Amino acid sequence: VGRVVVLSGPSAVGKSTVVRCLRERIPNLHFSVSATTRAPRPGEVDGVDYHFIDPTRFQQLIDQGELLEWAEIHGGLHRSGTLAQPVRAAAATGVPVLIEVDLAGARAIKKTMPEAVTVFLAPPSWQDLQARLIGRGTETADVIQRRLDTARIELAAQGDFDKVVVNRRLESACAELVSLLVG
Ligand SMILES: Nc1nc2c(ncn2[C@@H]2O[C@H](COP(=O)(O)OP(=O)(O)O)[C@@H](O)[C@H]2O)c(=O)[nH]1
């Protein structure tokens, strides 16, 4: 049976890098393909980038308990979420599964699939995260303050997760995640 790992963290401690490294390291890793009700962009392939479904069908899936989690995107322009069945089928086939979501999505997945392993990717320090959020300083004081407040709230509840991987260095953080996925 394949492990299911749920990767989350602060909304900007940086995850598309770690995900890329993980997919290169584990040749048959299944990266969960979310359902959405927006339309495809040119270049997007149904079943690969998203599972493109229509608003009516998505509501069916909600009511039948077929989403591990879902949310309204841009205040309800459309919806996106994680489908239970592909994840369960991949795991029963023996293939490891990675789900990458925001913190609210990860909290919801722990309820619908408790055997999933939740991992919070933390920064090596507060000062490290703060420097990245100031960045080049092209954002106003009010926006930066709001991002610093948001990060503190999100960091303060890393205890709800099963595992904390501290992102000190790409190669060791990615190594720790490989151990969880195929160990
Ligand atoms: N909770 C939930 N949100 C999702 C899911 N997939 C994508 N989203 C959100 O939809 C938004 C925009 O999607 P898009 O611009 O195509 O690229 P993305 O941001 O990397 O997913 C992001 O804020 C995501 O957090 C999902 O499976 N579940």
Side-chain angles (χ1 to χ4, degrees):
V1 173
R3 288 197 184 72
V4 187
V5 173
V6 178
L7 208 223
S8 196
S11 46
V13 98
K15 284 179 309 205
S16 99
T17 320
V18 162
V19 164
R20 183 166 155 144
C21 169
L22 285 180
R23 296 188 71 194
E24 283 168 359
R25 260 120 124 126
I26 304 156
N28 75 341
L29 179 60
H30 179 60
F31 189 54
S32 165
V33 178
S34 300
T36 187
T37 65
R38 71 162 169 85
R41 302 163 184 158
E44 290 185 317
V45 177
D46 189 40
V48 175
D49 296 275
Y50 285 86
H51 284 287
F52 297 100
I53 68 183
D54 81 14
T56 295
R57 216 127 270 191
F58 199 99
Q59 188 64 66
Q60 291 184 323
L61 295 167
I62 290 162
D63 292 345
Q64 295 178 152
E66 288 277 22
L67 275 316
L68 300 172
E69 62 81 36
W70 64 275
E72 315 274 17
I73 316 296
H74 310 146
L77 181 64
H78 67 89
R79 290 162 164 181
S80 283
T82 301
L83 288 164
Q85 269 231 243
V87 171
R88 289 187 197 272
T93 302
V95 7
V97 178
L98 183 64
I99 303 164
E100 196 238 82
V101 271
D102 67 23
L103 294 165
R107 278 192 244 293
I109 292 168
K110 197 60 178 176
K111 295 179 95 119
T112 50
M113 188 177 212
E115 73 264 29
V117 184
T118 52
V119 180
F120 189 101
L121 183 68
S125 60
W126 170 251
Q127 272 168 29
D128 186 280
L129 188 40
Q130 182 181 264
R132 281 177 293 127
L133 296 175
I134 296 167
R136 297 286 304 267
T138 57
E139 278 157 8
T140 63
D142 283 354
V143 172
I144 293 173
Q145 188 61 92
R146 178 186 176 144
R147 291 191 194 298
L148 303 181
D149 286 334
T150 297
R152 280 205 185 83
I153 291 152
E154 289 179 345
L155 288 171
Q158 59 188 270
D160 314 335
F161 289 63
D162 305 314
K163 292 278 162 32
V164 167
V165 170
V166 178
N167 187 351
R168 298 217 190 71
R169 169 106 202 224
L170 179 58
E171 300 98 312
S172 48
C174 176
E176 281 191 48
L177 286 158
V178 166
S179 298
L180 292 164
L181 277 157
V182 297

